[PDB]
Structure formats: structure tokens, C-alpha cells
Amino acid sequence: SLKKLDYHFHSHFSADSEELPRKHVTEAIAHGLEEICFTEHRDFYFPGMDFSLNLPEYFQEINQLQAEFKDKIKIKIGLEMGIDLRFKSEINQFIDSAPFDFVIASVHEIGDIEVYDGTEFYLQKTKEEAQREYLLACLDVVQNFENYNSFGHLDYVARYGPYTDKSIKFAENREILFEILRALASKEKALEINTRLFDDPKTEQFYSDLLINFKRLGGKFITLGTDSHIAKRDWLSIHKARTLIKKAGFHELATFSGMKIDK
Numbered sequence: 001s002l003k004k005l006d007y008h009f010h011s012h013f014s015a016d017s018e019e020l021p022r023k024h025v026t027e028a029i030a031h032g033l034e035e036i037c038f039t040e041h042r043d044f045y046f047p048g049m050d051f052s053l054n055l056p057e058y059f060q061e062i063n064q065l066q067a068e069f070k071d072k073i074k075i076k077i078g079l080e081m082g083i084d085l086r087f088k089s090e091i092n093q094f095i096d097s098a099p100f101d102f103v104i105a106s107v108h109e110i111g112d113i114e115v116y117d118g119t120e121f122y123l124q125k126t127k128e129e130a131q132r133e134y135l136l137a138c139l140d141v142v143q144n145f146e147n148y149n150s151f152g153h154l155d156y157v158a159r160y161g162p163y164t165d166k167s168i169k170f171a172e173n174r175e176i177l178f179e180i181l182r183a184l185a186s187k188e189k190a191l192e193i194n195t196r197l198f199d200d201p202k203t204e205q206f207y208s209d210l211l212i213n214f215k216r217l218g219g220k221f222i223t224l225g226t227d228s229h230i231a232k233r234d235w236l237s238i239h240k241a242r243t244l245i246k247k248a249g250f251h252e253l254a255t256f257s258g259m260k261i262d263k
């Protein structure tokens with residue numbers, strides 16, 4: 001059975017969350033989670049909004065919670081790092097500046113245009129065009145950046161936009177997704193199963209396809225996260241994800257300490 005965990009969530013330390021870290025912990029304990037990893041935002045020179053992170057304060061707060069809740073739950077201190085290859089050396093300096101336990105690499109903007117509701121990213125672009133541009137940027141990151149553990153939300157582009165049906169289909173992006181999955185596998189990176197959109201059967205179908213093909217292409221490591229910016233979680237969505245992961249033939253989730261896989 002898979003370790004009960006959440007490896008992607010945000011508290012007031014992130015620019016777009018105002019949640020109490022203690023509340024994530026008490027919610028996690030009430031559900032019976034064995035391990036959690038805070039993954040606060042850092043994105044360099046982000047368009048329209050600063051995603052900065054106060055490392056002294058962040059580490060101090062979580063370090064206190066680790067001590068207080070030591071006997072009840074395992075707590076890790078991680079990072080969701082927005083990647084843009086233009087800032088690779090600055091990004092690497094930041095990641096190397098503190099002893100993060102776990103790092104997610106995510107694409108949140110492309111060419112200083114944010115991928116989000118109401119931005120220029122989706123303007124006069126078909127959903128297929130938007131999906132292709134987003135996945136090409138992800139592939140670029142996987143090919144040229146190595147300082148992370150797991151690749152965040154491949155379906156991110158399907159959260160937003162003006163389309164009636166925002167879903168992403170594996171079949172319509174098969175070649176690029178194969179390239180991404182194989183590159184992750186060969187570099188021994190984890191694939192993140194992100195439960196944000198799991199209320200939608202089409203999201204389940206997409207991740208099921210991701211999982212089965214990752215396995216086919218040599219994938220070993222899977223991380224699981226809610227992406228919750230508040231403490232209240234959608235546990236049904238998490239349970240649905242856990243079922244897919246097991247069904248696809250993964251018998252363990254990957255956990256990390258100081259960015260090294262736990263044995």
C-alpha cells in the first residue's frame with residue numbers, strides 16, 4: 001500500500017496563499033497522513049506578481065512544527081520552483097542556498113506571459129495550440145534543467161483559459177508527452193500526480209494515460225500532491241489518484257530528504 005502523504009501544498013509563505021502552516025499539519029494528522037512536504041512558491045521575475053520566499057522565516061516556522069509534531073507525522077520542507085531557462089543560474093543559486101528536502105520544477109509562465117485565467121497566453125489561440133506551446137516549454141525545461149526532484153502538474157494548462165471544455169487529452173499530445181515522460185525516466189526524475197482537477201473524469205483519464213506510459217518508458221518515481229492553498233482538502237480526489245497509481249503498476253510513492261530519494 002502507498003504511503004499516506006501530501007507532497008504539494010502552500011501556506012502563507014507563498015505569495016498566493018494565506019493559510020496557517022499549523023492548520024495543514026493538524027488536517028494532515030486528522031486524516032492519518034504519515035508524511036507531508038510544504039512546497040512554497042519561488043518564481044523569478046514573475047509577470048504581474050512577486051513570488052518571493054522568506055527562507056529564514058519559512059525554515060524557522062516549519063522547523064518548530066517538525067519538533068512539536070515529531071511523534072505524530074513526518075514533516076519535510078520543500079519548494080515549488082517555477083522554471084524559466086533564461087534565469088537558470090539565478091534559479092540554481094536559490095535552490096542551492098537552503099537545505100530544501102524536495103523540489104518540484106513547474107512551468108507557470110512562458111516568455112513573460114503567465115499561463116493563467118485572463119492573460120494573453122490564451123488570447124486568439126486554440127486550446128490545442130495552447131497545450132502544444134505549454135508542453136514544448138515543459139520539454140525544454142526537462143531537457144535543460146536538472147536541479148529538481150519531481151515535475152509539477154503536466155495538466156496545468158488545462159486549469160485555465162476561455163475554452164468551454166478545457167480538458168487535455170493524451171492522444172492529441174502523444175508525441176510530446178512521450179518525449180517528456182521518457183526524458184524524466186531517463187534522468188531518474190519523479191512524475192507528480194497533481195490532484196487539483198481530479199473532480200473531472202477527464203483529468204483521471206489524462207493522468208491514467210500519463211502513468212501507464214511513464215511506466216512503459218522506464219518511469220520509477222511518483223510523487224502525489226493536492227496543490228492545496230488552504231488546509232481543507234479534497235480527499236476523494238487524492239484517493240482516486242492513489243487508485244490510478246496502483247493500477248498503473250507503481251507500488252511505492254517517492255519521498256525525499258535533502259533532495260535525495262528516501263530508501
Ligand SMILES: N[C@H](CO[AsH](O)(O)O)Cc1cnc[nH]1
Pocket residue numbers: 010016049080106108116227
Ligand atoms: N502559479 C500560481 C498558481 O498556483 As499553483 O502553480 O496551482 O501552486 C499562479 C498564480 C496564482 N495567483 C496568480 N497567479
Ligand SMILES: [Cl-]
Pocket residue numbers: 004005238239
Ligand atoms: Cl490519503
Ligand SMILES: [Cl-]
Pocket residue numbers: 043044045046
Ligand atoms: Cl524575483
Ligand SMILES: [Cl-]
Pocket residue numbers: 092144145146147
Ligand atoms: Cl541544472
Ligand SMILES: [Zn+2]
Pocket residue numbers: 010014016041229
Ligand atoms: Zn500557488
Ligand SMILES: [Zn+2]
Pocket residue numbers: 080106108152153
Ligand atoms: Zn504550480
Ligand SMILES: [Zn+2]
Pocket residue numbers: 008009010080227
Ligand atoms: Zn503549487
Ligand SMILES: [Zn+2]
Pocket residue numbers: 004031235238239
Ligand atoms: Zn486518505
